[PDB]
Design a binder for this molecule. Structure first.
Ligand SMILES: Cc1cc2nc3c(=O)[nH]c(=O)nc-3n(C[C@H](O)[C@H](O)[C@H](O)COP(=O)(O)OP(=O)(O)OC[C@H]3O[C@@H](n4cnc5c(N)ncnc54)[C@H](O)[C@@H]3O)c2cc1C
Ligand SMILES: CCC(O[C@H]1[C@H](O)[C@@H](CO)O[C@H](OP(=O)(O)OP(=O)(O)OC[C@H]2O[C@@H](n3ccc(=O)[nH]c3=O)[C@H](O)[C@@H]2O)[C@@H]1NC(C)=O)C(=O)O
Length: 340
């Protein structure tokens, strides 16, 4: 069975079984069944962060556990959201319902269960800010677990679910804490033009969606998995050196002296916008996004990434690391290794 509907990149590879789990017991059943048949199991929300490299030897579970629960506290609305829930429709609903605090993370694809995994962030906010806890099933034992946001170990596009807990657990629900006292995050890009007291949550939603819509490709049109590489963090010295010859480089300094750079700027600086390898290209309005321009095979996407990464590594000696998850036949492989 074909994985192509199940991943936003539009990559056509195959799995032994693909299965929609619409409740927790169901998911657990499908996992127990495939691992009892010696098969690997892959859980997916919408497949918007995965690149299939090969045909997959096991079972792919599509997490579709839905439902929202809202618990009132004097300080905050607490939401208990099913993993199979679509994140942008949750952002829309929460705002429609008078519970703001998710608008900066508007239009990010995927399911709510997947949002802790890579600490979803855009426009000044990461999921860690409104995340209370995450609920999982210990797939290997049925044991139901709850982690606090602290125990989640949130990082820039990181969490415990990319390490200790990865294939051991399946997320079934995420707990969100939205403060009743709304507080607008207007620190990023065109949001700094909005005033903190006149602005409604819906104008931030619109302001964010407009920046997104102007630069980012629709997977409906051309398949992609968003920002293919992470923004590089370099040493204080190396950032100063690159910024000596390249003064206008977007850079985001840390307290601890090190500097984050813009990976999309560095790719752009190598004149790779519009560059193609087979059906895969570097998107012209945002060079950090690789796309499925025409019936792209997974090897084309891997080669374009190897090409873009070598070019930036030769020009800037900054070596780019992918944010997309590389899935090979028996489970996830190392993406940098595959594009080296
Ligand atoms: C157009 C576009 C724009 C994007 N914009 C952003 C952005 O602004 N900011 C940002 O941070 N990201 C962004 N992304 C990346 C993407 O939306 C995130 O990585 C998102 O969290 C993935 O959601 P998903 O449900 O599609 O995960 P999937 O791709 O289905 O899975 C992701 C990984 O997590 C695992 N996982 C998925 N569901 C579960 C579960 N229930 N239990 C255990 N593991 C699970 C999978 O096995 C896999 O390793 C964008 C992507 C696209 C296509
Ligand atoms: C699809 C988006 C996405 O996540 C993205 C998020 O929405 C966005 C806003 O907060 O910031 C990241 O992109 P990015 O850092 O490129 O955001 P941008 O504001 O577009 O640009 C940063 C700097 O790069 C420059 N830039 C970017 C692309 C380009 O082709 N040319 C260029 O000059 C910009 O002008 C800017 O000064 C996210 N990425 C990471 C890896 O941290 C994802 O993870 O999938």
């Amino acid at each position: 069975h074909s994985l192509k509907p199940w991943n936003t990149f539009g990559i056509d590879h195959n799995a032994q079984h693909i299965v929609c789990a619409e409740d927790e017991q169901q998911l657990l059943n499908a996992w127990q069944y495939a691992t009892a048949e010696g098969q690997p199991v892959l859980i997916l929300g919408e497949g918007s962060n995965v690149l299939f490299l090969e045909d997959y030897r096991g079972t792919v579970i599509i997490n579709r556990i839905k439902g929202i629960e809202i618990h009132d506290e004097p300080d905050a609305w607490y939401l208990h959201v099913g993993a199979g829930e679509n994140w942008h429709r949750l952002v829309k609903y929460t705002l429609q319902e008078g519970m703001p605090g998710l608008e900066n993370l508007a239009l990010i694809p995927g399911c709510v269960g997947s949002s802790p995994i890579q600490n979803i962030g855009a426009y000044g906010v990461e999921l860690q800010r409104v995340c209370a806890y995450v609920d999982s099933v210990e797939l290997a034992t049925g044991k139901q677990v709850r982690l606090t946001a602290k125990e989640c170990r949130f990082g820039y596009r990181d969490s415990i679910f990319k390490h200790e807990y990865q294939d051991r657990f399946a997320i079934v629900a995420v707990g969100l804490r939205l403060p009743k006292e709304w507080q607008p995050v207007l620190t990023y890009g065109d949001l700094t033009r909005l005033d903190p007291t006149t602005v409604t949550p819906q104008q931030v939603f619109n302001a964010v969606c407009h920046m997104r819509t102007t630069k980012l490709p629709d997977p409906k049109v051309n398949g992609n998995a968003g920002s293919f590489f992470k923004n590089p963090v370099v040493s204080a010295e190396t950032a100063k050196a690159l910024l000596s010859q390249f003064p206008t480089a977007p850079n985001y300094p840390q307290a601890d002296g090190s500097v984050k750079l813009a990976a999309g700027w560095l790719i752009d600086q190598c004149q790779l916008k519009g560059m193609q390898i087979g059906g895969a290209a570097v998107h012209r309005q945002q060079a950090l996004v690789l796309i499925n321009e025409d019936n792209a095979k997974s090897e084309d996407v891997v080669q374009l990434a190897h090409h873009v990464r070598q070019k930036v590594g030769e020009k800037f000696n900054v070596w780019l690391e992918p944010e997309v998850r590389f899935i090979g036949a028996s489970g996830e492989v190392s993406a940098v290794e595959t594009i080296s």
